[PDB]
Design a binder for this molecule. Structure first.
Ligand SMILES: *[C@@H]1O[C@H](CO)[C@@H](O[C@@H]2O[C@H](CO)[C@@H](O[C@@H]3O[C@H](CO[C@H]4O[C@H](CO)[C@@H](O)[C@H](O)[C@@H]4O)[C@@H](O)[C@H](O[C@H]4O[C@H](CO)[C@@H](O)[C@H](O)[C@@H]4O)[C@@H]3O)[C@H](O)[C@H]2NC(C)=O)[C@H](O)[C@H]1NC(C)=O
Ligand SMILES: *[C@@H]1O[C@H](CO)[C@@H](O[C@@H]2O[C@H](CO)[C@@H](O)[C@H](O)[C@H]2NC(C)=O)[C@H](O)[C@H]1NC(C)=O
Ligand SMILES: N=C(N)c1ccc(N2C[C@@H](CN3CCN(CC(=O)O)CC3)OC2=O)cc1
Ligand SMILES: *[C@@H]1O[C@H](CO)[C@@H](O)[C@H](O)[C@H]1NC(C)=O
Ligand SMILES: [Ca+2]
Ligand SMILES: [Ca+2]
Ligand SMILES: [Ca+2]
Ligand SMILES: [Ca+2]
Ligand SMILES: [Mn+2]
Ligand SMILES: [Mn+2]
Ligand SMILES: [Mn+2]
Lengths: 214, 454, 216, 466
């Protein structure tokens, strides 16, 4: 099949910027490519067909170009609605194949996360479980690493993470890490820690607590 | 009656181009009348016949005409694991031309088409094609509704049902006042014949160059049939439009099928959904009844009337002997919802092999008496066989049985003078409608100007 | 106007089958090709196959030969996608596509049908309050919704009152059951001065539990 | 007593003969003043008119060539006589009428040409196999009717051009049957195979080497082939004095004039021969199919009897064409041509069962009328055609010629000829309107008003310029 290498995976840009997505195929497809847009939590819309032709209804700020095995989608002056996912698709050969996708994100100033750790509730412990929760709220950029430590030693088994899309207000990101253990296992140890590694600090932002102790 | 046969205007094209095979009047966005001329054997880039189109400005002297340029390069698209191919060699661009608004429609009925998928193919066949131009703006578009991407093996399995490979779309053409192009394709559905219709506005907006296979959603094609009466009937050899159902909101189609029902010939009037309203059957086998159709109110009652040409009709003569001379049939539309009756008038040619009725042109009201008139071609008629065009005048009861004026060909033998006609347009703006006559054998067009009645 | 109206979301067990539908709106399904595309967050977009509803001929990516079966009924003006012997990897969003002008393009898209394959039974969530440990000017609480099936759940604070300054994170699949959480931030003078409650509703099992956050 | 001759009060001899065929003129000098010179020939002799001065022409009809009808058309340097008499002299005075006769015989043992023109599209493959011994089988049966048989063979398919011809892939041009599991010949319009010959085994061996081709559309280009087989006299080899049978076998519809436009061909068929040394029709891709009227003209010009031997699915079609081409025969052909032999024998019998008189170059002032005698001496008035005849039968016609007035040209000639026949009757007409006395007139006679007039036939006539 034809491999569609779409780059970049994402880009942080601002309103009015002129950006350009590219798409590279494993062989020549002679302008038999289309470009698609998927607004967050919604379906797809057609942008370009046959490399350059705009789909009916698409604004003229969109434009496609390229030849052979290298094509480009370009948006002149970004609108607040253009921040979404974009995909390329070739139909030079069956089976049709798609690109990896490109997400346009809102650019802003860097921001360190607000970390908060939460021991297991009384209700959960009386049922036989034990979940330590670690919230990492409102940061920029999106690149962040969380690390769980039990009595100072790292722990990887039983971690459950979840991320939010770029917030509509401040255009930041937030993360929720959850470490689940059994009740019997949770009491073998005393110290519970989640370390946060972000662009905004060489030193990891550490928040922790001690079992029994409060 | 009052066409001027002394001071003619002659336009001309290249030798062997068959300049004058088809023609029409063209008004630009300012109302200035010109003559679009089709020359289906004009040479292309590879020194090979591809056809061509010329747009002739009106000049009393005539002369040469500038070309209306179209793309003549063969196209190839590798898409969907297939290879699409168009072949414009000997396509015959300009075998029919028609003007509507400021748009010109020129067609190549024998443009060939093929689709390759590995070792299989669709077969190289003449689907035909039409080219559309807006000369003032330079806009170009194409329309080829019979191109398909089905492989040859499939048609064989389904017994060639819905086989549009040999359409020759654009063989005949016409545009409704509302702007709907209607193509006659006499080879459609394995030589039964089909019609293709689509709005000109949607042809332009849905076309992009290099796609070759694209959808025109607003288009409408006629239907295949298992009835042998339609086999090899060439339904769509000629086409025309008119008002025949009494509902002014609908436009009815007139379709010629000159070999319908084992070469008996037929003409059918349909609505825009290809449902048959009437059928005129030919009188004599192989007379090619339906070769030409014309629609015009000839008796001044406001109801379009129908003329059908049968240029090969053999008139009975003494000693049980026949004589191929040609014949034209006039059908007057009855008042209200009623079927067209027997012909109101039969006009029959005189010169043996003259092919009287090969072309029938509405002239408008030539002598300005309140009744529309017609011109009938006999491209090999006249006492010398060089060709004649005969004018018949309308009257309260239909048409006159004898011609009011006879135009003898000014060209040499074999010019096929009158093979194409067009009238009912005032080209010099003198208040009287004029007549352009094609003579593709001589590669020329003669313009007859109408004058005040003497 | 061209619109492709697909079927509602499906929630089926492994080994069974499901038949999605794509009904045409404002046009005849017979006009063009109809495709089917499969989308997943990690794997991305994959082309299942196509059908010409005028004749019923179909093409498939050999990856889906066996599971995917595309049919079309011009009567109801609808195209179908049948999936057989369903697996957890068949959990994806499925779209039907058609072109605009180019015969081979992919321009108009349906809204998409969500498919979820799981053996989990209708389980109600477990709502746990999240109070901080025994200081600053800003305080943060939380609420843990664990072990419910199927999706979704609506989570608010004080019954829609406290809306601003809230982060409710997407659900995550934890061994055939879902786990969700939500945080909220206010000033220290608000809590525990004012009562903050976590309202969680799971219409599938028809349960609306509410837990008041109490300090430690 | 008085009559139309005297009561008219004529002025000259010429005017006297123009009154009525019964009037006569007396050119004698010794004639009473009151006695008229224009009367019945009896009344003039009664008035002592000199018999030599009596001008009274009588309409007659005498034969000049009266060869006997031949008993056998066999042999001879085409000296066979089918019509008798072959030439007569006819004399007519104004408004008079004379009658004569003519004999026509369907002579026994007359030479026959049979050119076999065969559809060779793919459905005729089994037909080719069944006629491999037709040349010898046909010679055995025709030997019972003639001792001078010649047969030839030609084949057609359709115009080798798109869309009638498959043009892709390149293999399809060399082998149209490529996408099947056989081979066939490249497509060909019309090809001549065997000139008319009496060596009937040449027919068999040429037929055994023939094979079919394949084209796209059901109607075929046989009318092209009928035209060339008719107008290419020297190539096909029709004999001057022989019956010409053109046997056209097909199982399909046919293309007609103006169908060629679907191949981009618009040039009318010129009715000329375009089969050269290669024995293929060279105008196939450039010239339109012929029209029925043009085919009729050439078949009649060359005395070709066309025979539509077609299968039952198109018998009605070709029966209806046969009505627009007079003199054409139709026979029902089996799906493998296994009955084409008896079909040809029956057509030859039907062809030689009719005698139809025809007139050429008849003057305007002459009108003819016919009484026919077919069967056993049964007269049939107002008829010039016999039917139901057999070889060796003889019919006869009584003809009466009526002249209106007197024409300017005094000697003309016309022809009576049966359709398809070689021999004919030539009628040399002479319009005897003048008198013999006019040849010895006296211009500027001193008998007629002091030289102001001319004296002819015993009366004074006003000369030129008066
Ligand atoms: C070869 O040529 C023959 C001769 O023309 C063709 O046969 C004719 O075909 C036409 C068309 O089908 C027939 O027309 C129909 O006539 C019928 C009445 O005819 C009566 O009288 C004849 C006299 O012999 C009888 O044989 C016959 O049985 C009838 O008793 C009507 O019933 C028809 O009217 C209906 O159909 C027409 C459409 O044609 C409608 O317009 C009418 O409103 C109505 O619904 C029709 O008029 C004709 O009768 C046929 N004649 C003969 C002698 O058979 C062949 O078709 C032709 N073959 C080929 C291959 O070309
Ligand atoms: C053809 O036969 C008709 C009779 O059927 C002939 O007509 C008669 O001819 C005789 C001649 O003796 C006349 O006296 C009669 O008056 C005619 N009767 C009619 C005309 O009814 C006719 O002469 C014959 N013509 C030829 C050329 O033989
Ligand atoms: N739309 C329809 N209802 C329709 C569909 C198909 C046809 N067809 C099929 C085609 C059959 N072949 C058979 C092989 N023959 C070999 C030869 O003759 O060389 C040439 C002819 O002829 C037809 O008229 C007519 C109508
Ligand atoms: C002419 O006709 C008359 C009467 O019909 C007949 O007696 C006579 O024999 C005919 N003459 C010839 C030469 O046949
Ligand atoms: Ca109407
Ligand atoms: Ca009218
Ligand atoms: Ca008038
Ligand atoms: Ca004018
Ligand atoms: Mn055939
Ligand atoms: Mn056969
Ligand atoms: Mn054919």
């Amino acid at each position: 099949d034809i491999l569609m290498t779409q780059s970049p995976s994402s880009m942080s840009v601002s309103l009015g910027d002129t950006v350009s997505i590219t798409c590279h195929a494993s062989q020549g497809i002679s302008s038999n490519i289309g470009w698609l847009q998927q607004k967050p939590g919604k379906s797809f819309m057609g942008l370009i067909y046959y490399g350059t032709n705009l789909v009916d209804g698409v604004p003229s700020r969109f434009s496609g170009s390229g030849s052979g095995a290298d094509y480009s989608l370009t948006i002149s002056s970004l609108d607040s609605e253009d921040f979404a996912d974009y995909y390329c698709v070739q139909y030079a050969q069956l089976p049709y194949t798609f690109g990896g996708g490109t997400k346009l994100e809102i650019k802003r100033a860097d921001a360190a996360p607000t970390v908060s750790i939460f021991p297991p509730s009384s209700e959960q412990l009386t049922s036989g479980g034990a979940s330590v929760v670690c919230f990492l709220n409102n940061f920029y950029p999106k690149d962040i690493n969380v690390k769980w430590k039990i009595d100072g030693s790292e722990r990887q088994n039983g971690v459950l993470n979840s991320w939010t899309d770029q917030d509509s207000k401040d255009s930041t990101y937030s993360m929720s890490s959850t470490l689940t253990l059994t009740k019997d296992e949770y009491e073998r140890h005393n110290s519970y820690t989640c370390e946060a590694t972000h662009k905004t600090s060489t030193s990891p932002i550490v928040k922790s607590f001690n079992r029994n102790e409060c | 009656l009052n066409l001027d046969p002394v001071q003619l205007t002659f336009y001309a094209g290249p030798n062997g181009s068959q300049f004058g095979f088809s023609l029409d009047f063209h008004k630009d966005s300012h109302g200035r009348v010109a003559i679009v001329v089709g020359a289906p054997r004009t040479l292309g880039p590879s020194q090979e016949e591809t056809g061509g189109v010329f747009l002739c400005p009106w000049r009393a002297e005539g002369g040469q005409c500038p070309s209306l340029l179209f793309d003549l390069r063969d196209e190839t698209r590798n898409v969907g694991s297939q290879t699409l191919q168009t072949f414009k060699a000997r396509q015959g661009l300009g075998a029919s031309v028609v003007s509507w608004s400021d748009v010109i429609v020129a067609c190549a009925p024998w443009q060939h088409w093929n689709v390759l998928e590995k070792t299989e193919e669709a077969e190289k066949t003449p689907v035909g094609s039409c080219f559309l131009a807006q000369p003032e703006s330079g806009r170009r578009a194409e329309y080829s509704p019979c191109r398909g991407n089905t492989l040859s093996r499939i048609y064989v399995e389904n017994d060639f049902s819905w086989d549009k490979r040999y359409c020759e779309a654009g063989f005949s053409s016409v545009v409704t006042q509302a702007g709907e192009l209607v193509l006659g394709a006499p080879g459609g559905y394995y030589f039964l014949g089909l019609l293709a219709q689509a709005p000109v506005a949607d042809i332009f907006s849905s076309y992009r160059p290099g796609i070759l296979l694209w959808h025109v959603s607003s288009q409408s094609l006629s239907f295949d049939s298992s009835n042998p009466e339609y086999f090899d009937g060439y339904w769509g050899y000629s086409v025309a439009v008119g008002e025949f159902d009494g509902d002014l909101n609908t436009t009815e189609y007139v379709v010629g099928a000159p070999t319908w029902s084992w070469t008996l010939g037929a003409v059918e009037i349909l609505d825009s959904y290809y449902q048959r309203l009437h059928r005129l059957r030919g009188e004599q086998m192989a007379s090619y009844f339906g070769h030409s159709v014309a629609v015009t109110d000839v008796n001044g009652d406001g109801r379009h009337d129908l003329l059908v040409g049968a240029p090969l009709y053999m008139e009975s003569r003494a000693d049980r002997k026949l004589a191929e001379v040609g014949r034209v049939y006039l059908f007057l539309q009855p008042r209200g919802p009623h079927a067209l009756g027997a012909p109101s008038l039969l006009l029959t040619g005189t010169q043996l092999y003259g092919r009287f009725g090969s072309a029938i042109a509405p002239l408008g009201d030539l002598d300005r008496d309140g009744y529309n008139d017609i011109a009938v071609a006999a491209p090999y008629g006249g006492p010398s066989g060089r060709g004649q065009v005969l004018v018949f005048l309308g009257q309260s009861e239909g048409l006159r049985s004898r011609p009011s004026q006879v135009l003898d060909s000014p060209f040499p033998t074999g010019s096929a003078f009158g093979f194409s006609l067009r009238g009912a347009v005032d080209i010099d703006d003198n208040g009287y409608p004029d007549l352009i006559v094609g003579a593709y054998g001589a590669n020329q067009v003669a313009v007859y100007r109408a004058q005040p009645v003497v | 106007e061209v619109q492709l109206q697909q079927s509602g979301a499906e929630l089926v067990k492994p080994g069974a089958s499901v038949k999605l539908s794509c009904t045409a709106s404002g046009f005849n399904i017979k006009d063009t090709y109809v495709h089917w595309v499969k989308q997943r967050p990690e794997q991305g977009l994959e082309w299942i196959g196509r059908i010409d509803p005028a004749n019923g001929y179909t093409k498939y990516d050999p990856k889906f030969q066996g599971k995917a079966t595309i049919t079309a009924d011009t009567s109801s003006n609808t195209a179908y996608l049948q999936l057989s012997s369903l697996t957890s990897e068949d959990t994806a969003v499925y779209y039907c596509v058609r072109p605009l002008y180019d015969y081979y393009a992919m321009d108009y898209w349906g809204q998409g049908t969500s498919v979820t394959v799981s053996s989990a039974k209708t389980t109600a969530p477990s709502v746990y309050p999240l109070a901080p440990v025994c200081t600053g000017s800003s305080v943060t609480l939380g609420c843990l919704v664990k072990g419910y099936f199927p999706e979704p759940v609506t989570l608010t604070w004080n019954s829609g009152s406290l809306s601003s300054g809230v982060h409710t994170f997407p659900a995550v699949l934890q061994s055939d059951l879902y786990t969700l959480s939500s945080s909220v931030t206010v000033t220290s003078s608000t809590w525990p001065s004012q009562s903050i409650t976590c309202n969680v509703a799971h219409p599938a099992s028809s349960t609306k539990v509410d837990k008041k956050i109490e300090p430690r | 007593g008085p009559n139309i001759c005297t009561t008219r009060g004529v002025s000259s001899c010429q005017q006297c003969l123009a009154v009525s065929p019964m009037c006569a003129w007396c050119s004698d000098e010794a004639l009473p003043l009151g006695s008229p010179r224009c009367d019945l020939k009896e009344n003039l002799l009664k008035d002592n008119c000199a018999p030599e001065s009596i001008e009274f022409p009588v309409s007659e009809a005498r034969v000049l060539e009266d060869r006997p009808l031949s008993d056998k058309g066999s042999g001879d340097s085409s000296q066979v006589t089918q019509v008798s008499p072959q030439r007569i002299a006819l004399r007519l005075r104004p408004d008079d009428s004379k009658n004569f006769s003519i004999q026509v015989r369907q002579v026994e043992d007359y030479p026959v040409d049979i050119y076999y023109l065969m559809d060779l599209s793919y459905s005729m493959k089994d037909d080719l196999w069944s006629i491999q011994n037709l040349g010898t089988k046909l010679a055995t049966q025709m030997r019972k009717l003639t001792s001078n048989l010649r047969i030839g063979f030609g084949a057609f398919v359709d115009k080798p051009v798109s869309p009638y011809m498959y043009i892709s892939p390149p293999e399809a041009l060399e082998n149209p049957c490529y996408d099947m599991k056989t081979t066939c010949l490249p497509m060909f319009g019309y090809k001549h195979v065997l000139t008319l010959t009496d060596q009937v085994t040449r027919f068999n061996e040429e037929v055994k080497k023939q094979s079919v081709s394949r084209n796209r559309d059901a109607p075929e280009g046989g009318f092209d082939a009928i035209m060339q087989a008719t107008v290419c006299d020297e190539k096909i080899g029709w004999r001057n004095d022989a019956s010409h049978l053109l046997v056209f076998t097909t199982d399909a519809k046919t293309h007609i004039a103006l169908d060629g436009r679907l191949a981009g061909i618009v040039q009318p068929n010129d009715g000329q021969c375009h089969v050269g040394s290669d024995n293929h029709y060279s105008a196939s891709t450039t010239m339109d199919y012929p029209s029925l009227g043009l085919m009729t003209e050439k078949l009649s010009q060359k005395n070709i009897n066309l025979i539509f031997a077609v299968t039952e699915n198109v018998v009605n079609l070709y029966q209806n064409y046969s009505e627009l081409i007079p003199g054409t025969t139709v026979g029902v052909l089996s799906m493998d041509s296994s009955n084409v032999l008896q079909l040809i024998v029956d057509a030859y019998g039907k062809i030689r069962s009719k005698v139809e008189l025809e007139v050429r170059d008849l003057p305007e002032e002459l009108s003819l009328s016919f009484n026919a005698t077919c069967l056993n001496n049964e007269v049939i008035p107002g008829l010039k055609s016999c039917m139901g005849l057999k070889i060796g039968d003889t019919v006869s016609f009584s003809i009466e010629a009526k002249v209106r007035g007197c024409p300017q040209e005094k000697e003309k000639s016309f022809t009576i000829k049966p359709v398809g026949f070689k021999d004919s009757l030539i009628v040399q007409v002479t319009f005897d309107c003048d008198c013999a006395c006019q040849a010895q007139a006296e211009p500027n006679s001193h008998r007629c008003n002091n030289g102001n007039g001319t004296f002819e036939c015993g009366v004074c006539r006003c000369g030129p310029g008066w």
